Structure formats: structure tokens, C-alpha cells
């Protein structure tokens, strides 16, 4: 009598460490001596996103971290020490060259950014704390798409907070230095797992001659 | 460059999976309901999803440094208090297991940093002093070991420490005493290639009322 | 006048114990084995001693304000940990008991104080918000239910609540996972003068290592 | 099968019970109403020394404080919390008249100040860093009676300790102001389980008339 | 002056301002009538204190125009409410209160300060009371320049940091968020520009930011 | 870019209207500069100091805050200003040195309508105009019962004489003045009156004794 | 004068110096030659900075016996590094660099801070640039004074909260962590003393400070 | 107390010596105090002013602190040394400040030797003395290469300069000297030579022009 989700434990690693980790021993070689992945990403806890899947990540190339809606806090180091670490770990240590912040369809994450009051009163642990992150992003699509249906609604503010996120990520310091020296780019991706669709932007960052007389 | 890097792999995914399981995403679009919640570090060698073979729909991933799980404070770590509130009590999820794993650089930095009032990192050891009860213990049953033992034993019981931790959020104690979840800490060394598992028992009964 | 109230007492106690039981406090004299730790509240109402008429050389006890144990921090909490350490370590303890009890007035003010960012106490808020959790859960699974009811959850999580921090004590764990130790949580409701006492159960099992 | 320890918990509170808080409902009657001590207690945790013992004190008498070493840290909202908060919420709120904190022969935690060298190297996950708060204490009897031996030695160092105690008492305001308005006083106390004996001190504080001209 | 001595800065100033009342002031009704009442300029202008570039002339700004703020060697430090208020006041009234649109740092030729940045050893040792203390500010500029340009004469060193300069400093005015709200919400645009008198010359440049898809595949 | 733009054609205007008609002009100050004035002048659009007294390039080294301030020496927090007076006083050494205020200050306002009890609602802006904390405190004591918009005008020119007052903390402004290599001047622009008002200030050291 | 005008000021500071040089200096060559190396007071001096209580006079304080500090009401301000600087260095220098063995606050008769303190309603509104922020220090003394003798007429008041206050600053030592120290060590000890110069008297106390066994049973 | 004693005798000795000796002078003084100095002086055992100037009770308001220094106006920092001045100045009505600085100074000895370089190892003499940090610089500038004991009287006597620079930050201060109603000198006594010197300081505001 064994465990379903121990043995599915089991039986999953055998079969990575056989179809995978073996037929590979190249890769592995050099993966147990250090890291370097070029990405950096931020993606939604959302069993249905993984990253390594929807953008077909191979392993040593992007680090990633996994939260609720894929919010980017901004730069706080007695609230926001785990984000501020990764990112710092990131930037600063196994250099990755881009940032990706992606939202996805259905978050349950946003959808109940939408859906909380946030007027003094809290009915969550930790959720409304979190994700309150989002309020900028939340007001925005709010006022400007103000009747605009639920299902529709979300999606507008998936997007939004990803922007909003990618705004708290210029509030660290490596972040934009990243910027100027053009170590360090920055992206937002939005999943779409219903139509099965992924778009994709970034951020302008550099300067341009203008004239010269 | 790195943007067609990304669009390529998307592609990939679309057709050869995406697609390839109509029936499969037709539903995953619908809703979720993964039984697990996973707890692995960031770094970019362990995906969880590659090392366990999850399918998109299994598990509600929560990636950090060092894959720790700091204790319950609504002030400090909401991060991880938001998603442990999730997992559990919105998505149902049936166990909780923290992953490590070996040649944490994580790990490796709560090792070597002092922590005695000096800090060089903005927020890196801020994050990992998460683990300095670990850090405390081993150096204390492992401290003439060679730094090679003394890093796996850390990483494991690092393990063990965010276990613990775990134990003080009041949703999750419930759901254990409910057996409607298990706590469980898994070890993967991607240099041997080898994986371990073990579960953690917790109860609670009433003795007597005069 | 304070100091004979001091004196009288200390010669009642002399003659009336200390005296009467030679071959008793001869034999504490050479040194201490309890058997239990425990954790009460400051309040003067409650001495574990007198509530649970313990002798001289049974108990090793930990007396703070609403008989919080705060989690693992060398930094923040070394009173705690220092004496956790010690009867564990040291003494070799079998049992750790948290006492919570009715009308606890360190409770009371968890439960006024809106920890919203403000604080109108030097210290008192900031200790109690080691309680939180159990504020949380109370008022979510019993936010209608009148004051006198909603304190009582309050004590009894509370005590919950620090045995789950108890448990982020790596010598705590290791202890209970040896069996050489027992985690209990007790209530005295010295209004109606009763007592509850119940026990907590943790366990730690190797799966698998492929 | 029953737990011992559960038991004597049992036949404890039943002794309690039916001996102690039936036999005096006047008492507990008033009690469960609220307290008012006029003392605030600091002793060992050590199990030979409750101070409800010792000094014979009755319910509702004493709001005590137990510790390892009897120690009273110095004010600090950061480190030291626990200390200051049972001090606040005595001297504000319960209103106390006295502090008193007793120290007690053959103290494992005075003894483990005197043995640990406090010099960059901790054996000990906590009691170390929580018994430096005693270092002052140590200094002087150290440096005063350098060649006595451990077991006198260790008993200056008790007193002593909590001389540094009580001078740390001073930097709480609340406890300044209280002896500014004579509404408290402060105690130091000394008890010897081996010879059964008990010394006390205090705290001299007040303005005195010198001349007048 | 028949004996009676006379101050010649009291009078050049009479002289001067007479002249903008009676030339400007006093043939401009419409502008100055409603320029009493209140500011909008679309500029905010950083230009050294050197007395040969006054930004009015180099680039004809008008009464209304232009928010100047002017100092050695026209530096932008980084937010610090306790050691750059000045600065820091400047840009907060005119981007939040003034709302202006844009904020051009102008950097110049021959700059007195940028070659004290250059010329001073920064090794520990001060030997200005507030010099080296202000133009610090331009070190990272200094490391760059020294770095990609090591073997370079002097002079040219000091162009090359001229230019140099204004880019930290409009990487500094990154650390005020009041700045990045304004990029983000498209309300103010960054420009860096460089006046060679000697020569006789204008460069312009910005700063490009802004979110912008790439697919939607 | 209309902003570009306007830019452009600015300088070009300058280019050929000024530049190139002042050849013997421009070739000397291609050399360096040695203005005989130092103005502050305040960072307003309106009292840019170049029109108001028609000064030519390379007659006043300038300095432009809000509200024209001059806070006292003080190398940690405003070694800004005080970089500006060493340049202008020990290296340029300028004759002058002239503090410019004007009516309808908008730092002035600032200074009178925050309440400076604590409380701030500002990053930088009441940080700084705290500096003229004196001029408002002397304002109210002599005109505290006055509408505000005079209020404005007396706390404008007491401001100008507060950092006049801050200059004579710079010991090189002091020794300048002792020395008669440097004299201090406080002025106020009516914008609204079309007015301009100039006065000096006087500053001296004579050795009295020694026994 | 013949003429030529001369200044009382600058002739009363020259008589005045000459007077002591004169009859103290120069008639105490072992006592100055011994200052001329070093002080070691043993006295730190609170006095008010009113004219008529010097405490050399008053107390007949000889050169290189008390170190002193003269202010508004003699006011002892609690521990601040950023609002009481002045007030902490003096004894900060006092007590560990001098080693000062006492620290005297004397208040005295007809104080005009103290009258201020009582005159001033301390209500929100301020008339003073600074006098009300400084005197405020005794808001504590005028509180007590005005409960326990709210009837009594103004002048007893005044009297009252002259004491009352040099009270609230031997307290305010003790916000000073070597001031407590100094007295634990029994290096230091403190007093507080009253002048009053109507009638012509002088009233010192002193703070009781020190351990005391009570029993050994 | 031989403390208490000292004390006790010291008052007595000045009781028959001076206080019963004087009825009219101390009947005058008992009604109110009109004194024509505010003298600024070291709280240095050794500089007692009114031994030093030999001033008689009721001719001096007295300030002293460590190194005789006079902040700049600030309300929120220095408002003990503010409410002297203010109370001297539009109270009694003064009509002279003196500061004076004397030969070994202990504040100007630390102001020399410490670094100021963002570390203190003091609680608050670093923070006070950073007052004279501008006499430091110009000594430093001018006789940097000095013996430290020339340092250190250059530096004492540039520390009472700078003091009277921060006396013209009080706006009642520069009023009284327009007025004439007010002087301002600097006094530097060596009580190792056995010397006092004295030097004035000349202020004042002139109308220059209206247009
Ligand atoms: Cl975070
Ligand atoms: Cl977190
Ligand atoms: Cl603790
Ligand atoms: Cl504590
Ligand atoms: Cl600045
Ligand atoms: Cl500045
Ligand atoms: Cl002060
Ligand atoms: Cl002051
Ligand atoms: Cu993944
Ligand atoms: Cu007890
Ligand atoms: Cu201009
Ligand atoms: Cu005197
Ligand atoms: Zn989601
Ligand atoms: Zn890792
Ligand atoms: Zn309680
Ligand atoms: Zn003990
Ligand atoms: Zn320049
Ligand atoms: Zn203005
Ligand atoms: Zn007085
Ligand atoms: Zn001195």
C-alpha cells in the first residue's frame, strides 16, 4: 500500500532520469558545474503555465521565479526581501540578460485583484495583501474600461499589471543600471491557454541622436 | 534575438503540445485542480516540471531562492503566504513538498555569510537567513565535515527548517489534521542524479477537559 | 514595608519547606532533572506552580506576557530560544507544555490592536504580533460569534499557534522525532475552574531514494 | 495506558482544584474580575526557584517573569521585545510598586556566562547570546576577585548580574519615571538553595534636602 | 562724475535692467500680461553657471519657456533628501507642480567643473572645500571615459566627459520616481544636449523609453 | 519632435544672430571667462537673469534655484551652493555677487503656506525652502495680520536677506569682503509692476585692541 | 576726548581685562601656571544665562573649578542627538572627558524663562521665534506645579516652578547614559540648587542614588 | 559632602562680601535686569567671563557651551542658543554681542582631530563641534602645513569668526545692526601668554535703487 503521490513522485523522476537526465550526459556534465541562464522569469504559480512548457525552456536557460498572478513588487527589503533576492540573484550573479514578466488568461490571481473591495476591509491571509501589488494596474483598465465585461475586464488587467510590474522593476537599482549599460533587457508576455496565444513586448530603453549642428 | 528565442519556443509548444492534446487543454482552459504544490528553488537546472515530469494542470509551482518557505507574517513575507493560502485553501491542492537540491547557490550563501550585523547584499541574506536555524544545527552535528557533506546536510535540512515552517501557518496545520494534505521534503542532486523523499506526520488529540 | 512582606515570606517558606524536607531540597541543592518545561503567561493569577502543583525540581518554566513562543531568531528572539535550548539541550526535559488561560490580557490586546501600521505601545504590540495567525483564523471561523467566545479561540490558537513555532526549533523537532520529548498545549479557564490539555503529534518518515 | 506526564498534569489541577480554588471562593470570585500585583518578579526558570515558592506568594500577588539567569535586558524594541513588553505592561498597566529581580545559587546560566569566552566563537544556538546580557557583571567580578574559586566566584557573579539587570531596568522611561514619582521602587534579591538562605537589596532614589541659606 | 564716486555693477545693473524694460518688457504687453498671472513651460533646463552659456541665449529661450536650474558643470545628482534637496526640489516642482514636459540637461565645451572632475585625484585627499564634493557626481563618467579612451590627450578627455556626464546625469534623474512616472505615463521625455562655444556648435540627443509589442503569435 | 524642434531652431537663431555676428566677442570667451557678477536668481521661466538685466555671455556666472536660495556652508548637505561660490569667489573671483528675488515666488508660497510642524507633503520641496524659515519667522512677527499676497512680497525681499545673511557664513565671502575684492547686493523683480529694486550689503572686521 | 569718539563698549571689555590681569592673573603665577596646562573641575554648572546669577559670584566658583553651562532658565534638554546637541556635548565632555564628580542645575528667583514657561498657553499657536521651543523643556514642572498649587498667586508660581523645574532637568540627566553611568560607579553625583537673590538666600538638594541591603534572613 | 560644603561655604563668602556689601546695587537688580552685554563664551573651567572681563552682576547675559560657538538659526536644532539670542536681543535689549574664544580650546582640538568623514566615535561633541567645520576648512587651506598648536589658535580664533558669520543668520540680529542698536565683536583670550584681543564687526543694508 503506497502512497498515489509519493509513487507518482517516483515513477516521474525515473522516467526524467532515464529518457532525460541519462540521453544527455553532455548537458548534465556541465550543468552540475554552474549555471547561466540568459532569462530571467516571472511567471504565474498557475499549474496550467509552467513556464519551461509554454515557452519550451530547456534547463540552464532561465531562472525563474512562480507566484501568485506573477507580480513584481517593487524594491522593499523588510517587505519584499524574496523577490528583491531573486532578482538580485539574478541581475547581479548568474547575469541574465533579459527580464519576462508574463501574465496569463484566467488568473485567479488578477481575478481577485478585481474582485476585492480593498477599502480597509480584508477577507484573505496573504492573497489581498499580495496582490494588492496590482491596485495601479487594477484602476487603470478599471477607468478606462469601466463597462466593459468581467471575462474581457481580467484580461485587460492581466496585461496591465504585467506593465505595472515591469514599472516596480525600474525601482531597483541593478534593474536599471542593467538598462543603461545594456546588460539587461525588459519583456512582458501574455499566455492565452483558451485560444492558445502568446504575445509578446518590451521595453524601449537607450539613447538617440537627435541632430548635430 | 532573445524575443525570437522566445516566440520559436512557443511556436513549438503550440503544435507539438498545445495542439497535439485538444481534449487535453480544452479542459485545463476550464479551470484547475492540481493535488500538489510545489515549492523548488529558482534556479534555472531544477525545473520541477522537467525533474518530476509534471504535466501543465499537476501542480501550482511556487519558485524562490533556495526554495525556502519562511514562517507565517503578513508584514514580511505575504509572497509566500499568498500562495500557500491559495494552493490550500482555494485550489484544494492534496500535499505540499518542498524540494532542495544539490549545489544551491542559495544555500551556499547562507553558508559562507556571517551574519553577525554585517550585510554586502541588498537582498540576499535578508532572504536567506530564513535558513539559519539549518545553518545552526549542521554546523553544530557536521562541523569537522568536509564542506561538500556540510552543504548537502544544509540543503536538506533547509528542507526540514521550511517543513517546520510550514507548520506555522494555521491553514495548513488544519488541512494536516484533516489528512486532506501531507507535507513531504524531496532532494534532488542533479550531479549523481539521484532523488529522495520523505513525509512529515503531524496530529494534534485531546488528552482531557476537568 | 514591600521588603518584610518579602522577608516573612521567605521565613515561612524557610521553616515551612525548606526545613521540613532535608532530604528534599538536600538533594535539589546538587543539581536539577525536570521533566517538563513549561510556558504560562506573566499574568499573577496563573503560577504554574500553584495551578498545577508542581514542586521544587519538576518544572523548568519560561513566564512571559500571554505565554507566546515566538519562532526561531537569534537576533530577535534569544530569551526564548536561550531557555528552549537549555531545558532541551541541557536539562534534558521530556515535555514542553503551553499554557494559555482565560482572561488573558495579553490576548485581549492582540485582539484590539489593529496592526495596520500603527503602534501605541513601546513594546506590547510588537510582541503579541507573534499571535496573529490565530487572530486570523478566529476571525475568519468565528468573526460572528460574541467577544467572550472569540477570546477564548484566541487563548487556545494562540497556544496552538506557539506550539507550531516550537516547532521551527531544529532540537525541538529532533527530540520529538526521537521520542524523548512530547509537545502538549494546555488552557486554564480560572473563571470556571477548569483545565484542558491536549497533545501535539510530529513525526518525520524516509520514502524513497532512487 | 495513560501518560504519566499527562497524569500528574491531571492530579495536579484536581489537587489545585478542589484543595486551593474551591476552598477560598471569595478569593477567585474577585480574581476573575481582574489583577493588581504589587510586585513584578524576575527569576531563574531554573525548576528549584518558583518564585511563588520561595517567597510565598499568593495568587494575584506577583506578575512574574521567568528567564534563563533572571536576566533584564536592556531596552531595545528590536532584539528584546519579550523583556520590554512584560516590563511595559507591569509597570503601565498593572501598575506594579516593585521590580525585583532575584538571582539564586548555582545558576547554570551565570555559570555558562563565566565559562564561555565571548570571543567571536558561539557553541550554543542561543543561551550565548543571551547570557552576554550579563558580560558587565562578569567583567567586575572577573577583574575583582580573579583568583576565587569558580564556586565563590560564580556566586558574586549571580549578584552581581543582577545589579547589571537592575542598571539596565534605567533605561526603560517608564521605569525612570516611575521612581521620578516614587510610584515604584526596585529590589535585587539573592537565594542560596544549599544554605537555605536570602539576601535583599534595593535601590536608594529620591531628592534629600542638603541646606538651606 | 564732478567728485561724487559711482558704483559700476549698481549702475550696470540699472543700465541693464532699464534696457529689458524699456526693449522688452514694455513692447510685449500681451506676453508679460499674462505671464503675471502665471508658468507653464514646457522645459526644464539644467546648464552649468559658466557665464557663456546662459541657456536663454544659446538656445533664444523666452520669458515663460523654459524652468532652468544652473550649477557647475550642469549635474543631475541621484535622490538624496538629506545631501541634493536643492535638486531635488527643482525637479519635483517642475515636473509635479509645473508639469513640464520635458527635461533637457545641457552639458558644454571648456567646462570648468568637468575638468576639476578630471584633473582632481579622488584618491582621499580633498583640497577644495566644496569642489571635489560636488563634481564627485561625475565620477562614474570619469571611470567610463578614462576606460574607453585611456590613451587620449587631455583635452579630448574632457569632451568626451563633458558628454559623459550628462548621460550619468540623466541616468540620475532615473532615480527620482516622480521622473520615471512621468516617462511611463508619456508626460515627460529625457533629452541630453552639448555646446561647444569653441567651435560653435549644438548636439541633441534623448532617451527612448516606452513598452512596444514585438509579436502576437 | 516639436520639442527637438524648438530646440533646433533656437540655436540656429542664436547661431547666426549672435555667434556669428560677435566673432572678436566669441573668440575671447573661447579662451575663458571672468565675469565680473555672481547672481542667484530664482529656477522660474519668468526672471531668467540674462533678459531681466540684459547680461551679455561672460558677465555673470549663475546659479538658479527655487526661490533664489542661499542656504549657509554646510559641505554635507549643500556643497551644490557651496561649490558654486568657491568656483565664483577663489577661482573666477567675480566682484559681485548678487542674491535676485521676485514677486510671486512660487518656493516664497511654499515657504508661507506649509506648516513646517513635522509633518511634510513634499519629497524635496519643503526640505529645501526651510532655508528661509527666518525671513517667514520675521514676516509674521511684523506683518502676521496682512493679507497673504503681501505677506508674499515682504517674505520675497526678507528671504533675499536671509541668504545674504547665509553668504557671510562662507569664509571666503567674508574674507572677500574684508579684503573690498568682492561686495554683496540683494535684489527683487516686480514682474507684475515691471519694477526692479537694488540694495548693498556692507561687511567688514577692524582689530580693535590687544593687551 | 578731545574730539575723537570712543567706544564704552570696547574700553569697558578693555578696563575689565586689564582689572583681572592685574589683580588675578598676574597675583596667582602658581595657580595659572598650572591651568595654562589643563582643567579638572570638579564641578559641572547648570546656570541661567540671566545677568545677575553668575555662579562664579553666587557661588564663588575660583578659575578651574567648575566647568559651566549658562542658558535660557538653566534648562537640561532630555538625550537628542538632532534637536539637543549643545546640551549634550557639554556634558558628554563634562562627565567623560573632564570627569566631572558632580553635575549642579541651579534655578533661581525671578527667572524670566520660568515666567515665560507660566506666561505661555503652549496651546498650538507660537509668539516666539524660539523662546517658547526651548522652555517647553519644563512643560512637565509647569503641569505638576500648576495641579498641586493650581490656587496660589502668580509670583508663588513662578517660585515653584523655578524649583520644580531644576527637578525636571536633574531627571532629564538621567535620559543621558553616562550621566547613569556615573552615579552607579559612584563617580558621579547630582545636585540641585536655588538662588534666590530677592532675599538674598540659597537652597541646595541633592538626587540619593545606590544599592543598600535591606536583609539577609 | 565636602562637595556640598564647598558649595555651602562659597555661598556664605559671597553673601557678606558682595551680596550685604552692595544693598543698592542688589536692591536695583532684585526689580529687573538691563545688563548692555550678551557675551558668548567656553564652558571651560578656566574662562569664567565674568572673572576674565571682570563683569559685575547685572552687566552681562551669559551663554556658554562647549568651544563658544554660535550655530546658525534653525529652530528644530539650535533652539537653546536661538531663545538666548532672542531673549537678549528683543528682551533685555542688549546693545553687544561678544564671542570669545580662548587659547587651548578642548571643542576646537576636537573639531581638528576629528575627521568628520561619516563615522563618529563621540554620542555628541563630533555633532556639535561640526559647527566650526568652515573655520576648519579656511585654516586649513591657509596654514594646513602648520604645527597642530597653530592650527589650533589659528582654528580658535577663525571658530569665533565664523560664529559671528552665524549671529548674521538671525534676522533681529542683522535689524539691530542696521539700527545701530546693536554691535557685534570677537575676543580671543590666552590664558597661557596672559593677552586679550578684541575686534569689531561692521553690518548694514543701503537702499540702492528703485526703477
Ligand atoms: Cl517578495
Ligand atoms: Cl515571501
Ligand atoms: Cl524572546
Ligand atoms: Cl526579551
Ligand atoms: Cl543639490
Ligand atoms: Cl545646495
Ligand atoms: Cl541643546
Ligand atoms: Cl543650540
Ligand atoms: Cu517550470
Ligand atoms: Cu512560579
Ligand atoms: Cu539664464
Ligand atoms: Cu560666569
Ligand atoms: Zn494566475
Ligand atoms: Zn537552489
Ligand atoms: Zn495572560
Ligand atoms: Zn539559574
Ligand atoms: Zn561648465
Ligand atoms: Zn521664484
Ligand atoms: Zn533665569
Ligand atoms: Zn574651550
Chains 1, 4 share one sequence.
Not at 503506497?2 to 523522476?13: L, Q, V
Not at 526524467?16 to 550543468?31: I, M, Q, R
Not at 525563474?64 to 522593499?76: C, F, I, K, Q
Amino acid at each position: 500500500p503506497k502512497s498515489e503521490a509519493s509513487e507518482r513522485i517516483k515513477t516521474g523522476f525515473l522516467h526524467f532520469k532515464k529518457e532525460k537526465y541519462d540521453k544527455n550526459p553532455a548537458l548534465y556534465g556541465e550543468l552540475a558545474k554552474g549555471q547561466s541562464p540568459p532569462f530571467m522569469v516571472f511567471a504565474c504559480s498557475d499549474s496550467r503555465v509552467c513556464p519551461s512548457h509554454v515557452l519550451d525552456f530547456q534547463p540552464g536557460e532561465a531562472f525563474v521565479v512562480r507566484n501568485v498572478a506573477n507580480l513584481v513588487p517593487p524594491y522593499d527589503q523588510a517587505k519584499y526581501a524574496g523577490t528583491g533576492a531573486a532578482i538580485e540573484y539574478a541581475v547581479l550573479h548568474l547575469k541574465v540578460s533579459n527580464i519576462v514578466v508574463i501574465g496569463h488568461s484566467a488568473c485567479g490571481g488578477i481575478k481577485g485583484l478585481l474582485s476585492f473591495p480593498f477599502d480597509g476591509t480584508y477577507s484573505t491571509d496573504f492573497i489581498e495583501e499580495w496582490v494588492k501589488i496590482g491596485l495601479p494596474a487594477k484602476a487603470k483598465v478599471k477607468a478606462q474600461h469601466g463597462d466593459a465585461p468581467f471575462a474581457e475586464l481580467c484580461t485587460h488587467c492581466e496585461k496591465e499589471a504585467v506593465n505595472a510590474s515591469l514599472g516596480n522593476l525600474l525601482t531597483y537599482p541593478f534593474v536599471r543600471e542593467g538598462l543603461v549599460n545594456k546588460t539587461l533587457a525588459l519583456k512582458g508576455g501574455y499566455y492565452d491557454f483558451v485560444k492558445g496565444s502568446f504575445e509578446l513586448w518590451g521595453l524601449e530603453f537607450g539613447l538617440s541622436s537627435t541632430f548635430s549642428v
